[PDB]
Write an enzyme that holds these catalytic residues in place. Structure first.
Site, mmCIF file in Angstrom:
data_model
loop_
_atom_site.group_PDB
_atom_site.id
_atom_site.type_symbol
_atom_site.label_atom_id
_atom_site.label_comp_id
_atom_site.label_asym_id
_atom_site.label_seq_id
_atom_site.Cartn_x
_atom_site.Cartn_y
_atom_site.Cartn_z
ATOM 1 N N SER A 154 0.848 -1.181 0.000
ATOM 2 C CA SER A 154 0.000 0.000 0.000
ATOM 3 C C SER A 154 0.885 1.233 0.000
ATOM 4 O O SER A 154 2.076 1.145 0.290
ATOM 5 C CB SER A 154 -0.856 -0.005 1.278
ATOM 6 O OG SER A 154 -1.511 1.238 1.478
ATOM 7 N N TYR A 167 -2.207 -1.191 10.464
ATOM 8 C CA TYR A 167 -2.113 -1.387 9.023
ATOM 9 C C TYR A 167 -0.789 -0.839 8.494
ATOM 10 O O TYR A 167 -0.099 -1.501 7.718
ATOM 11 C CB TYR A 167 -3.269 -0.678 8.319
ATOM 12 C CG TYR A 167 -3.310 -0.931 6.830
ATOM 13 C CD1 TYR A 167 -3.990 -2.033 6.309
ATOM 14 C CD2 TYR A 167 -2.667 -0.072 5.945
ATOM 15 C CE1 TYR A 167 -4.032 -2.272 4.935
ATOM 16 C CE2 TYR A 167 -2.696 -0.299 4.568
ATOM 17 C CZ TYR A 167 -3.381 -1.399 4.074
ATOM 18 O OH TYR A 167 -3.420 -1.626 2.718
HETATM 19 N N1 LIG Z 1 -8.567 -0.964 -2.195
HETATM 20 C C1 LIG Z 1 -7.563 -0.112 -1.986
HETATM 21 O O1 LIG Z 1 -7.718 1.094 -2.230
HETATM 22 C C2 LIG Z 1 -6.244 -0.515 -1.472
HETATM 23 C C3 LIG Z 1 -5.106 0.458 -1.280
HETATM 24 C C4 LIG Z 1 -3.873 -0.182 -0.759
HETATM 25 C C5 LIG Z 1 -3.731 -1.456 -0.480
HETATM 26 N N2 LIG Z 1 -4.779 -2.397 -0.658
HETATM 27 C C6 LIG Z 1 -4.511 -3.787 -0.313
HETATM 28 O O2 LIG Z 1 -4.843 -4.617 -1.388
HETATM 29 C C7 LIG Z 1 -5.358 -5.888 -0.912
HETATM 30 C C8 LIG Z 1 -6.693 -5.992 -1.598
HETATM 31 O O3 LIG Z 1 -7.575 -5.037 -1.000
HETATM 32 P P1 LIG Z 1 -9.018 -4.902 -1.614
HETATM 33 O O4 LIG Z 1 -9.372 -3.498 -1.813
HETATM 34 O O5 LIG Z 1 -9.332 -5.776 -2.780
HETATM 35 O O6 LIG Z 1 -9.909 -5.401 -0.345
HETATM 36 P P2 LIG Z 1 -10.931 -6.548 -0.194
HETATM 37 O O7 LIG Z 1 -11.425 -6.553 1.206
HETATM 38 O O8 LIG Z 1 -11.969 -6.501 -1.251
HETATM 39 O O9 LIG Z 1 -9.993 -7.815 -0.504
HETATM 40 C C9 LIG Z 1 -9.274 -8.461 0.561
HETATM 41 C C10 LIG Z 1 -9.670 -9.916 0.556
HETATM 42 O O10 LIG Z 1 -8.934 -10.517 1.638
HETATM 43 C C11 LIG Z 1 -9.740 -11.523 2.153
HETATM 44 N N3 LIG Z 1 -9.211 -11.890 3.455
HETATM 45 C C12 LIG Z 1 -9.116 -11.113 4.574
HETATM 46 N N4 LIG Z 1 -8.596 -11.748 5.614
HETATM 47 C C13 LIG Z 1 -8.339 -13.015 5.136
HETATM 48 C C14 LIG Z 1 -7.792 -14.155 5.758
HETATM 49 N N5 LIG Z 1 -7.392 -14.240 7.011
HETATM 50 N N6 LIG Z 1 -7.660 -15.291 5.000
HETATM 51 C C15 LIG Z 1 -8.072 -15.229 3.691
HETATM 52 N N7 LIG Z 1 -8.596 -14.229 3.014
HETATM 53 C C16 LIG Z 1 -8.705 -13.128 3.803
HETATM 54 C C17 LIG Z 1 -11.107 -10.882 2.190
HETATM 55 O O11 LIG Z 1 -12.197 -11.821 2.349
HETATM 56 C C18 LIG Z 1 -11.153 -10.145 0.853
HETATM 57 O O12 LIG Z 1 -11.759 -10.837 -0.246
HETATM 58 C C19 LIG Z 1 -5.322 -5.774 0.618
HETATM 59 O O13 LIG Z 1 -4.106 -6.362 1.105
HETATM 60 C C20 LIG Z 1 -5.333 -4.267 0.840
HETATM 61 O O14 LIG Z 1 -4.742 -3.929 2.110
HETATM 62 C C21 LIG Z 1 -6.020 -1.956 -1.159
#
Ligand SMILES: NC(=O)c1ccc[n+]([C@@H]2O[C@H](COP(=O)([O-])OP(=O)(O)OC[C@H]3O[C@@H](n4cnc5c(N)ncnc54)[C@H](O)[C@@H]3O)[C@@H](O)[C@H]2O)c1
Ligand SMILES: NC(=O)c1ccc[n+]([C@@H]2O[C@H](COP(=O)([O-])OP(=O)(O)OC[C@H]3O[C@@H](n4cnc5c(N)ncnc54)[C@H](O)[C@@H]3O)[C@@H](O)[C@H]2O)c1
Ligand SMILES: NC(=O)c1ccc[n+]([C@@H]2O[C@H](COP(=O)([O-])OP(=O)(O)OC[C@H]3O[C@@H](n4cnc5c(N)ncnc54)[C@H](O)[C@@H]3O)[C@@H](O)[C@H]2O)c1
Ligand SMILES: NC(=O)c1ccc[n+]([C@@H]2O[C@H](COP(=O)([O-])OP(=O)(O)OC[C@H]3O[C@@H](n4cnc5c(N)ncnc54)[C@H](O)[C@@H]3O)[C@@H](O)[C@H]2O)c1
Lengths: 261, 261, 261, 261
Positions: free
Chosen positions: C145, C158
């Site tokens: 991130s 985080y």
């Molecule tokens: N969306 C954003 O703007 C953004 C910005 C920076 C970083 N990220 C990172 O990108 C990744 C994807 O985020 P996203 O937006 O698609 O969020 P999201 O919540 O849609 O996807 C995360 C997925 O992780 C799964 N998950 C959580 N804990 C788990 C566990 N213990 N075991 C298995 N699966 C688990 C959830 O069910 C979910 O489908 C994350 O690591 C997030 O921190 C996202």
């Protein structure tokens, strides 16, 4: 405060005003011998000299434009001739002016690069040359800015000059570390000096700048002079090649407070 | 050296040995009241306590495992109960052990993360909670490593714990800057402490480490204690959220000396 | 687009939604064999599976909680058993929740560290163990991130987890570079996924986030999937240990636009 | 590979040899129209032109010294006059020479700063000026080095020029992000080009450099051209202000492999 600074010879470029002046006074208070530098206005230099005499310090003022090689060489030689040696070199002179990048003239770009970066290189080169030829474990402190890290629209020349200063300092620090010569950068945030007097005069502009400082206040010159004194002392014996930011938290990304984004 | 440290209450985790011990002694010399911390037995703590009495300092020793929440809470409360307040919190406890990353057990990974990162979070949380509820402009100093920046094969858990500590510190610094609470990291390079006694005992290993230090020598604990004392003082009033590396130049990429590459 | 991805086996944790889902679809379009992962809700997984079939891709869904060691081990083994090999491991699962740092419970802190950091370590460990034992020049991509660099008040757990991920990735990259195993981080800024649906639903909150993005718009999942596909390909053959930020300029300090400060 | 590059006009400074030449050929293969640049004679330019014709590409060669303002202005205008527009500007020209820092002449320092930094500023300025006046969402790619991060004894001018380039790029990226103009840096490690032919010719020197590269091999120009093509494409639509290192792991601190230190 730092007993090891007593008797040390310190040269500071652009020290007739602002941060340079505050550092000159602080080092005088530490009983170091100071060489003040003025570009043209000698009257401002005599002023700093009076503040130094006020604290019982010893100092001299030497004219010199840091963009003129012979002036920088003479500045260093003057310190040696007057006080017999050189221990600390502080490259502090600098300038800045706002211009949209795509409209910036080569002339403006060069003026800032020549003064802020090349001037510091010349000062560093002459001090280190002396240190090496005389087996002196001296130190060089370069005055940078939070902008060696934080981009600065309208000041692309300034940002480039400080980003360049960062790598220059780290390179010199690595190159001469085996000889005991320490080279470090100080990175001030927004500080109350003449270069910001008009900007900070306006209540709207002042509040605007303060909103970009997590600690909530514009720093005072003495808070930067404190950093310079410590870095020059033996307390910082194992510290070299770093940039010590004194910015009230500016480099921490102020817009992200309160979990925004 | 720093008059403002007189009467300040300083808590240091894992201070019965090494860097923690040196910092405890230095702060005592600055006339601060110190709270030493030991994990199980107190013999190692008694040595530091005797060194502190030797310099006319005042201190107490409190048992506490930084991986146990109630122990950390009690450590902070003990300082307040004994000395009436808390001014400086230093999270210094830590551990490390070498294991090829693809062969590292979850157990080893967790032990290091729990102690090095989570332990520091708990200490920081409790100190800041106190500072906020009592309107105290205290400071938190977290002991990191050059490895919050320099990767470390065989110590992936340690590197991850310090990289995490960097962001934890910068986040806390930004979050509480408006309240005058400063949070900073110290990043030591190779220092002569018990955690490296055996390694530095071997002439081949010692020479190997020294070859990775531009300044050419392994630092002494006092050189790190000097940094902690300065960061805790009002001299560093405008400094927050930084990592001050004291590593003899380790972070400057030692392999590139002599224009190699 | 990338011919070398055809036939490659890609495992993506937390790929039943958001970025993970978009990457699963993109890799399927590149003719790679994909292993989707769901924690509990299998229905969401079947959905991604239908999108993959829609593009003529081949994939399977495997249940697994990344905080459970045996689940991570089984996830990797399932890919090998089903498709005969493993080429790309993408640790994408993660979670976040806002809480003032001094009020954050150990429980909340651990949940995020365990999932975001330790979960990625386990995934990386198992993939690399396989690569090493079978002389495969595979690659690991960790989803980070902008917050492995930008502090994040209210999300200290985080930020610490991603800062730790940065050093974990760089360490693994250095440790296994001699074996041809590349390890890289992707650092997304604000992206339009379900984890931000409610936040971006509110016109005031949306405009607030957009003001922190120099490019002026919230990114789409496909813009991040494009980065993952490139990093996994042989086009990025000489790239390892980096964090590729795809954030519309967030890390450039948005508050300093227009020469402010 | 990248369909969106078809018909795009790309200008590359110093493209008659090395990395510039490889990028010119790669972009031609992507069906982009290329403007090659040579400093004095055109024989080296004719080779690239023939290589481009060999792949069915369209290109022209324009004489121009990047340290001469009118030459840079003419280079950009020539692209517009010949192909009707400009889409991608790549500042690649550069030079380096080893000299101990304390012995480096102002002349040598200026030559490198003028070419490596100021030359890139001029190219960036002219391209962006055009983009802004014509509402074109163009992109600027600046050729940096691992040395915008890794200090370089004996090459202090080069290190300073690239460190300056980093801040220049990040500033321009922030300043023009609202207009859809992306500005990024590519940071190559040791690459097999004519500037290293003699050095890599010697078996001892070659082995020495390879020991500083975790991946164990000196990169090929095509591996850098791959990065430039991707950054110029719409696949990297949300990427701006970054430095994409393609160095086989050089920035990961090679001396710390095997848990040393
Ligand atoms: N969306 C954003 O703007 C953004 C910005 C920076 C970083 N990220 C990172 O990108 C990744 C994807 O985020 P996203 O937006 O698609 O969020 P999201 O919540 O849609 O996807 C995360 C997925 O992780 C799964 N998950 C959580 N804990 C788990 C566990 N213990 N075991 C298995 N699966 C688990 C959830 O069910 C979910 O489908 C994350 O690591 C997030 O921190 C996202
Ligand atoms: N004031 C701040 O908030 C702030 C923040 C970051 C960095 N800095 C840096 O700190 C240094 C001190 O800044 P300051 O606020 O005291 O500004 P200032 O203008 O008061 O001090 C700079 C001094 O440099 C001198 N100078 C300029 N060009 C010169 C030349 N060619 N030869 C010799 N002397 C020359 C000026 O006459 C002046 O006295 C500068 O390098 C500045 O970029 C200041
Ligand atoms: N010595 C170095 O060269 C060096 C370099 C970088 C960083 N550091 C860091 O500095 C700190 C001090 O290291 P040091 O060299 O003095 O090592 P040390 O082992 O002598 O000191 C660490 C102390 O932590 C204590 N400790 C460990 N786990 C604990 C727990 N759960 N609860 C309470 N106390 C616990 C130990 O008993 C020990 O006294 C550590 O965080 C270390 O990672 C040291
Ligand atoms: N080769 C590497 O390993 C490596 C590593 C890092 C960075 N770089 C950078 O990549 C770029 C390409 O380097 P390269 O290896 O192809 O070197 P190169 O010498 O083959 O290419 C540089 C080109 O710049 C031209 N040039 C120099 N000064 C000029 C001027 N004033 N006006 C116009 N053209 C000028 C030269 O004639 C030459 O063709 C340079 O900026 C270099 O610093 C190269």
């Amino acid at each position: 405060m730092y007993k090891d600074l007593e008797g040390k010879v310190v040269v500071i470029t652009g020290s007739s005003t602002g941060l340079g002046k505050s550092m000159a006074i602080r080092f005088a208070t530490e009983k170091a011998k100071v060489v003040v530098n003025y570009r043209s206005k000698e009257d401002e230099a005599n002023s700093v000299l009076e503040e130094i005499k006020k604290v019982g310090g010893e100092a001299i003022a030497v004219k010199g434009d840091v963009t003129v090689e012979s002036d920088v060489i003479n500045l260093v030689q003057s310190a040696i001739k007057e006080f017999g040696k050189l221990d600390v070199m502080i490259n502090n002179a600098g300038l800045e002016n706002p211009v949209s990048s795509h409209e910036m003239s080569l002339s403006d770009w060069n003026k800032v690069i020549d003064t802020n970066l090349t001037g510091a290189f010349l000062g560093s080169r002459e001090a280190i040359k002396y240190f090496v030829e005389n087996d002196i474990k001296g130190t060089v402190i370069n005055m940078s800015s939070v902008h060696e890290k934080i981009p600065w629209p309208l000041f692309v020349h300034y940002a480039a000059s400080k980003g360049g200063m960062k790598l220059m300092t780290e390179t010199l620090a690595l190159e001469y570390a085996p000889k005991g010569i320490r080279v470090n950068n100080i990175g001030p945030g927004a500080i109350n000096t003449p270069i910001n007097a008009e900007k900070f005069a306006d209540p709207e502009q002042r509040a605007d700048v303060e909103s970009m400082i997590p600690m909530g206040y514009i720093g005072e010159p003495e808070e930067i002079a404190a950093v310079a004194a410590w870095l020059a002392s033996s307390e910082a014996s194992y510290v070299t090649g770093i940039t010590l930011f004194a910015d009230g938290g500016m480099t921490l990304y102020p817009s992200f407070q309160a979990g925004r984004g």
